[PDB]
Design a protein around this motif. Structure first.
Motif, PDB file in Angstrom:
ATOM      1  N   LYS A 104       0.576  -1.308   0.270  1.00  0.00           N
ATOM      2  CA  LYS A 104      -0.001  -0.023  -0.296  1.00  0.00           C
ATOM      3  C   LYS A 104       0.868   1.418  -0.241  1.00  0.00           C
ATOM      4  N   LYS A 105       1.633   1.560  -0.913  1.00  0.00           N
ATOM      5  CA  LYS A 105       2.548   2.990  -0.886  1.00  0.00           C
ATOM      6  C   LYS A 105       3.227   2.607  -2.640  1.00  0.00           C
ATOM      7  N   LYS A 106       3.926   3.000  -3.339  1.00  0.00           N
ATOM      8  CA  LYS A 106       5.120   2.881  -4.503  1.00  0.00           C
ATOM      9  C   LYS A 106       5.388   4.096  -4.775  1.00  0.00           C
ATOM     10  N   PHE A 107       6.655   5.039  -4.003  1.00  0.00           N
ATOM     11  CA  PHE A 107       6.775   5.945  -5.172  1.00  0.00           C
ATOM     12  C   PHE A 107       8.601   6.285  -5.155  1.00  0.00           C
ATOM     13  N   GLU A 108       8.377   7.097  -6.493  1.00  0.00           N
ATOM     14  CA  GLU A 108       9.558   6.989  -7.788  1.00  0.00           C
ATOM     15  C   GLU A 108      10.484   8.645  -7.058  1.00  0.00           C
ATOM     16  N   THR A 109      11.914   8.555  -6.252  1.00  0.00           N
ATOM     17  CA  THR A 109      12.526   9.649  -6.094  1.00  0.00           C
ATOM     18  C   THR A 109      12.919  10.160  -7.696  1.00  0.00           C
ATOM     19  N   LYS A 110      13.688  10.572  -7.606  1.00  0.00           N
ATOM     20  CA  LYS A 110      14.035  11.542  -8.725  1.00  0.00           C
ATOM     21  C   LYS A 110      15.506  10.994  -9.237  1.00  0.00           C
ATOM     22  N   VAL A 111      15.284  10.676 -10.555  1.00  0.00           N
ATOM     23  CA  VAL A 111      16.301  10.312 -10.796  1.00  0.00           C
ATOM     24  C   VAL A 111      17.709  11.423 -10.474  1.00  0.00           C
ATOM     25  N   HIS A 112      18.955  10.008 -10.843  1.00  0.00           N
ATOM     26  CA  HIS A 112      20.257  11.542 -10.201  1.00  0.00           C
ATOM     27  C   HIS A 112      20.859  10.952 -11.150  1.00  0.00           C
ATOM     28  N   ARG A 113      21.058  11.701 -12.397  1.00  0.00           N
ATOM     29  CA  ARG A 113      21.832  11.213 -13.222  1.00  0.00           C
ATOM     30  C   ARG A 113      23.546  11.068 -13.057  1.00  0.00           C
ATOM     31  N   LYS A 114      24.488   9.725 -13.571  1.00  0.00           N
ATOM     32  CA  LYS A 114      25.426   9.950 -12.841  1.00  0.00           C
ATOM     33  C   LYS A 114      26.264  10.418 -11.842  1.00  0.00           C
ATOM     34  N   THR A 115      25.316   9.195 -10.746  1.00  0.00           N
ATOM     35  CA  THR A 115      26.283   9.797  -9.202  1.00  0.00           C
ATOM     36  C   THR A 115      26.056   8.793  -7.888  1.00  0.00           C
ATOM     37  N   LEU A 116      27.273   8.476  -7.882  1.00  0.00           N
ATOM     38  CA  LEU A 116      27.562   7.582  -6.847  1.00  0.00           C
ATOM     39  C   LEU A 116      27.114   7.847  -4.924  1.00  0.00           C
ATOM     40  N   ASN A 117      26.832   8.905  -4.877  1.00  0.00           N
ATOM     41  CA  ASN A 117      27.098   9.802  -3.401  1.00  0.00           C
ATOM     42  C   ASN A 117      26.482  10.785  -3.546  1.00  0.00           C
ATOM     43  N   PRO A 118      24.941  11.238  -4.218  1.00  0.00           N
ATOM     44  CA  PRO A 118      23.925  11.900  -4.765  1.00  0.00           C
ATOM     45  C   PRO A 118      23.161  12.421  -2.714  1.00  0.00           C
ATOM     46  N   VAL A 119      22.844  13.573  -3.182  1.00  0.00           N
ATOM     47  CA  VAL A 119      21.837  14.307  -1.611  1.00  0.00           C
ATOM     48  C   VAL A 119      20.604  14.544  -2.501  1.00  0.00           C
ATOM     49  N   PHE A 120      19.552  14.194  -1.451  1.00  0.00           N
ATOM     50  CA  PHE A 120      18.332  15.447  -2.044  1.00  0.00           C
ATOM     51  C   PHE A 120      17.311  14.838  -0.938  1.00  0.00           C
ATOM     52  N   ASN A 121      17.468  14.435  -0.163  1.00  0.00           N
ATOM     53  CA  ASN A 121      16.211  13.693   0.839  1.00  0.00           C
ATOM     54  C   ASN A 121      14.397  13.672   0.223  1.00  0.00           C
ATOM     55  N   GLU A 122      14.369  12.667  -0.463  1.00  0.00           N
ATOM     56  CA  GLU A 122      13.112  12.727  -0.544  1.00  0.00           C
ATOM     57  C   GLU A 122      11.521  12.588   0.305  1.00  0.00           C
ATOM     58  N   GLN A 123      10.506  12.790  -0.059  1.00  0.00           N
ATOM     59  CA  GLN A 123      10.000  12.646   1.441  1.00  0.00           C
ATOM     60  C   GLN A 123       9.745  10.840   1.114  1.00  0.00           C
ATOM     61  N   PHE A 124       8.720  10.066   1.733  1.00  0.00           N
ATOM     62  CA  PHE A 124       7.890   8.998   1.384  1.00  0.00           C
ATOM     63  C   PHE A 124       7.053   8.474   2.473  1.00  0.00           C
ATOM     64  N   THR A 125       6.299   8.573   2.008  1.00  0.00           N
ATOM     65  CA  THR A 125       4.621   8.771   2.890  1.00  0.00           C
ATOM     66  C   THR A 125       4.979   7.526   3.126  1.00  0.00           C
ATOM     67  N   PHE A 126       4.846   6.576   4.054  1.00  0.00           N
ATOM     68  CA  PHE A 126       4.678   5.088   4.432  1.00  0.00           C
ATOM     69  C   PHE A 126       2.960   5.094   4.752  1.00  0.00           C
ATOM     70  N   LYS A 127       1.881   5.065   3.837  1.00  0.00           N
ATOM     71  CA  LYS A 127       0.964   5.171   4.038  1.00  0.00           C
ATOM     72  C   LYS A 127       0.517   3.594   4.119  1.00  0.00           C
ATOM     73  N   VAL A 128       0.020   3.640   6.039  1.00  0.00           N
ATOM     74  CA  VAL A 128      -0.182   2.589   6.288  1.00  0.00           C
ATOM     75  C   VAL A 128      -0.131   2.862   8.390  1.00  0.00           C
ATOM     76  N   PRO A 129      -1.262   3.056   8.747  1.00  0.00           N
ATOM     77  CA  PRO A 129      -1.849   3.294  10.209  1.00  0.00           C
ATOM     78  C   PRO A 129      -0.820   2.268  10.847  1.00  0.00           C
ATOM     79  N   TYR A 130      -0.763   3.300  12.044  1.00  0.00           N
ATOM     80  CA  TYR A 130       1.117   2.913  13.138  1.00  0.00           C
ATOM     81  C   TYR A 130       0.253   1.643  13.346  1.00  0.00           C
ATOM     82  N   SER A 131      -0.394   1.705  13.500  1.00  0.00           N
ATOM     83  CA  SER A 131      -1.479   0.403  14.181  1.00  0.00           C
ATOM     84  C   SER A 131      -1.068  -0.633  13.616  1.00  0.00           C
ATOM     85  N   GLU A 132      -0.901  -0.907  12.359  1.00  0.00           N
ATOM     86  CA  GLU A 132      -1.249  -1.337  10.602  1.00  0.00           C
ATOM     87  C   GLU A 132       0.344  -1.863  10.646  1.00  0.00           C
ATOM     88  N   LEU A 133       1.885  -1.473  11.219  1.00  0.00           N
ATOM     89  CA  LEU A 133       2.823  -1.022  10.663  1.00  0.00           C
ATOM     90  C   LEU A 133       3.401  -2.141  11.647  1.00  0.00           C
TER      91      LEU A 133
END
Lengths: 128, 133
Positions: free
Chosen positions: A51-80
């Motif tokens: 119940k969740k699927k997110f694609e980050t921004k492609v990081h062209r030719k980089t083995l140590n890229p920074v971005f800090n994407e926000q992934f929303t774990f769609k699922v009730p804490y009680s369900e986690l």
């Protein structure tokens, strides 16, 4: 296996019922593109729950890229408790069959969402 | 008291948590009844892994990838072996021909057939089943 390391800070939301997977960046990522480099993007996936699927921004030719994407774990804490999140870093060479340079996961049930889960996650190259 | 047979490998809190879906992972928890399988010796040396009272039956994908849910195909038949290292070994006779024996990734999941040979110590599983002693 070895995919390097990934720094992240995960927090929980009890209003909308979602875990905030706030990763900082990935270091020492495997190569893929023609030049000891790759276009690694983290594709946040989940176990059966799926119940969740997110694609980050492609990081062209980089083995140590920074971005800090926000992934929303769609699922009730009680369900986690019954949901194992999986973070796989996918390449985007844009020529050959994009390979999964690596990934990482952790049993949410063991992740006591007391406040914020920040740590230097180790990355492993899961042959897919 | 033959019941929930817990099995895992690789030093570190991580248990094989099976789910009806099939995607079994090394969950390090013992609160939710989803890390127990009915491990038993079906035939002379042939042990089967079936999470009856908790999940599903195993069915390796050509050994290479370990999974289970639909049906306990022969792929799920393994030879019970023991190593003098306080660990259990199970040889997937179904693929023994290739010297492949069921191997899982404590922090990944069960799917290392291409390396089920003497390569990853993860093959030495540590069982914690409720025996009848």
């Amino acid at each position: 296996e070895k995919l390097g390391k990934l720094q992240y800070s995960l927090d929980y939301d009890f209003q909308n019922n979602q875990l905030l997977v706030g990763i900082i960046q990935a270091a020492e990522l495997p190569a893929l593109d023609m030049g000891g480099t790759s276009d690694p993007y983290v594709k946040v996936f989940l176990l059966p729950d799926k119940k969740k699927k997110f694609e980050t921004k492609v990081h062209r030719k980089t083995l140590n890229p920074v971005f800090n994407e926000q992934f929303t774990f769609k699922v009730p804490y009680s369900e986690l408790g019954g949901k194992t999140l999986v973070m796989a870093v996918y390449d985007f060479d844009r020529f050959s069959k994009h390979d999964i340079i690596g990934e990482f996961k952790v049993p949410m049930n063991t992740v006591d969402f007391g406040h914020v889960t920040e740590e230097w996650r180790d990355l492993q190259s899961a042959e897919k | 008291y033959k019941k929930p047979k817990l099995l895992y490998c690789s030093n570190g809190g991580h248990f094989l948590r099976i789910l009806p879906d099939g995607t079994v992972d090394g969950t390090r928890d013992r609160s939710d009844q989803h890390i127990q399988l009915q491990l038993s010796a079906e035939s002379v040396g042939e042990v089967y892994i079936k999470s009856t009272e908790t999940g599903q039956y195993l069915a390796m994908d050509t050994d290479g990838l370990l999974y289970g849910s639909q049906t306990p195909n022969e792929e799920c038949l393994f030879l019970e072996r023991l190593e003098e290292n306080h660990y259990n070994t199970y040889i997937s006779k179904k693929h023994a021909e290739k010297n492949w024996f069921v191997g899982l990734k404590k922090n990944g999941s069960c799917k290392r057939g291409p390396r089920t040979h003497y390569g990853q110590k993860a093959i030495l599983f540590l069982p914690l089943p409720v025996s009848s002693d």
